[PDB]
């Protein structure tokens, strides 16, 4: 639905003194929905490319490295790997 | 030979007139009415059939 609270929290994380107008907030929701749907469609296609009946984090890493340009791809797989090594640490 | 757009005459086309810079409520859903969007399977089936008849190009 609306993912406004998590965006407000990361906004407080990077620049706490800032806020956001509601129009820009709905545009943020639209953008995050669109990019999530693009990467999810890419992952659903890869659920058939590599023949796996399930989707692992390698597929999401591939989708990130494909849909993104040079710097952002590596700079996002970094955060992905940090969070997955955090979840694998129980 | 042609018309002009730089010089005199541009500002007249930007005039604010209320009866034209507004919308109308014919065939418009009331804001009080609640409407639910598509499910995944519905839109996937619709777009699959749509691409098939886009190769078809029946109408025309």
């Amino acid at each position: 639905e609306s993912y406004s609270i998590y965006v407000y929290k990361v906004l407080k994380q990077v620049h706490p003194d800032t806020g956001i107008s509601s129009k820009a907030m709905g545009i943020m929701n639209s953008f995050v929905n669109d990019i999530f749907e693009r990467i999810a469609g890419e992952a659903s296609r890869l659920a058939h490319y590599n023949k796996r009946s399930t989707i692992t984090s390698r597929e999401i890493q591939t989708a990130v490295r494909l849909l993104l340009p040079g710097e952002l791809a590596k700079h996002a797989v970094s955060e992905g790997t940090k969070a997955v090594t955090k979840y694998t640490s129980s | 030979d042609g018309e002009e757009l730089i010089g005199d005459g541009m500002e007249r086309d930007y005039r604010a007139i209320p009866e034209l810079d507004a919308y109308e409520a014919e065939g418009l859903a009331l804001d009080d009415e609640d409407v639910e969007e598509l499910t995944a399977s519905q839109r996937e089936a619709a777009e699959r059939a749509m691409r098939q008849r886009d190769r078809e190009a029946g109408r025309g």
Binding site: - | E37, R43, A46
Partner: protein
Amino acid sequence: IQGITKPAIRRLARRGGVKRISGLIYEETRGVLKVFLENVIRDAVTYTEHAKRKTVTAMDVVYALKRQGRT
């Protein structure tokens, strides 16, 4: 019926930096507008029809726009 105001086309030309148009471009622009409108409205009405209701929402519009590459 081809109801687009001519100064709207002039404003469109100005936003694109066009300088000298002829007295014939208006019909071509109306035709291309109708060309794009018919396809996008066909996609939107199909999305509304498979939703099992008769209401056209902005979400249908963005879903129709997503196919071309504009989100």
